[PDB]
Design a protein around this ligand. Sequence first.
Ligand code: HEM
Ligand SMILES: CCCCCCCCCC(=O)N[C@H]1CCOC1=O
Length: 454
Amino acid sequence: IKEMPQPKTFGELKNLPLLNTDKPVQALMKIADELGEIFKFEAPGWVLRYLSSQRLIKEACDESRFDKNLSQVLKFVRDFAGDGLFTSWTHEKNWKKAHNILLPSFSQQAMKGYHAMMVDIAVQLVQKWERLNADEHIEVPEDMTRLTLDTIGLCGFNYRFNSFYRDQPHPFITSMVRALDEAMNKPQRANPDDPAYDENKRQFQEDIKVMNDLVDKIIADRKASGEQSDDLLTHMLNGKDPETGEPLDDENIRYQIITFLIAGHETTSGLLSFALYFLVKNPHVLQKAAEEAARVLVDPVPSYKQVKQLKYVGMVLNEALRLWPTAPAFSLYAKEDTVLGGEYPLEKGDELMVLIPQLHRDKTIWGDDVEEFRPERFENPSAIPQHAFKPFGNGQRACIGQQFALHEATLVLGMMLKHFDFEDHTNYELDIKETLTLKPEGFVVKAKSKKIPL
Ligand code: HEM
Ligand SMILES: CCCCCCCCCC(=O)N[C@H]1CCOC1=O
């Protein structure tokens, strides 16, 4: 039985001021680097144990001992995402109900049906870049976010955000981004009732209204039409949970749509942005991926089968998730009193946070060269130990969108590599901005068209 390390304290605020930063996950990674595989983090309101080693994270991933927890941030995201799949407790009826209804809509087999509207958006990205003038550059995370938001809008509810027609975000997105920012900031506040936060609280209620009104109208408009589209909203209006026999009600459908739009905006766009960052920084890898794209994508429009054939592009995406898993943490709670790693006693209800970027740098698993971008780590995927690579979370509370995100990312990265050469014209210095997710802020490239028609 060992005493766990604890970072520096600030008197009665304990560790909480360590999160008073725009880059809290990067701060926690440096604390993990100093303290090791586990540390305690105390705040006036709560305690977290942060895990970084495969040894301890493999135990935390045992669903008989530990279940998904909502962190303080997810409890505040729940003020707009409600009991949607991401912000529900496993024991809430609406979690298993929505899980059983939506799993078949997110299968690899379902991707065949979404492929054509993913291509619609991907072609809009390629056409944008083909139409840039010689002196111009690409704002990478900006354009990837236009793409990924628009893809989930169209595949999810046949709604076109038309992000490539805009500089200023859609008003729905203005409100969602500002609501996410308020949720992430509320926990680092020592006096949340201070009157200096009154305008923040008023703005938060307004943003929740903007989101509820567009989404509630989208649902009500589809119910009125009877239109049977190939989309998640049709699936949710018609579906019945095989276990309870119940359909989702309209409130819970709104929370799922809000949840999917948060995911589409925040996650896949980060993955694509980090993948392009690693490619321009590692030109031999770029050339392997470009060669595969040229060999495989032989038609003007990629097919579903051709995307599945892009093995090396998939290895690039997995190695970007290893170094910078764009959703970088998930929380668990102890179901009962238990001892972690034969050393750290936990009480029923004790909260854990998995630092996925630190798990993915465990030298006992990956070797000493963990900071190197090497897609070949994923060439023979059964070689990775159980619970060593967790960019989509764990068990029954793993990402439902994993096959959607990887199909879209593989399609788009394959098309980008088929159509363009890329230049890191600024020798860009990685700067990682943190929202719900990680993205490379200020990342710009120049593209040179290969002049290959669509
Ligand atoms: C590369 C892209 C993505 C990454 C890295 C990612 C990562 C994750 C992770 C780490 C979790 C677990 C959260 C936790 O345990 O608290 C999760 C859950 C979830 N993700 Fe994703 N995500 C991605 C894309 C998406 C997309 C595109 C969608 C939907 C369109 C989505 C929908 C969800 C939902 C609904 C859950 C909750 C699942 C459940 O608990 O039932 N994700 N994701
Ligand atoms: C799916 C990715 C979710 C992003 C979460 C990453 C945030 C890291 C900062 C953190 O540990 N904050 C804790 C402290 C108390 O309450 C929280 O929530």
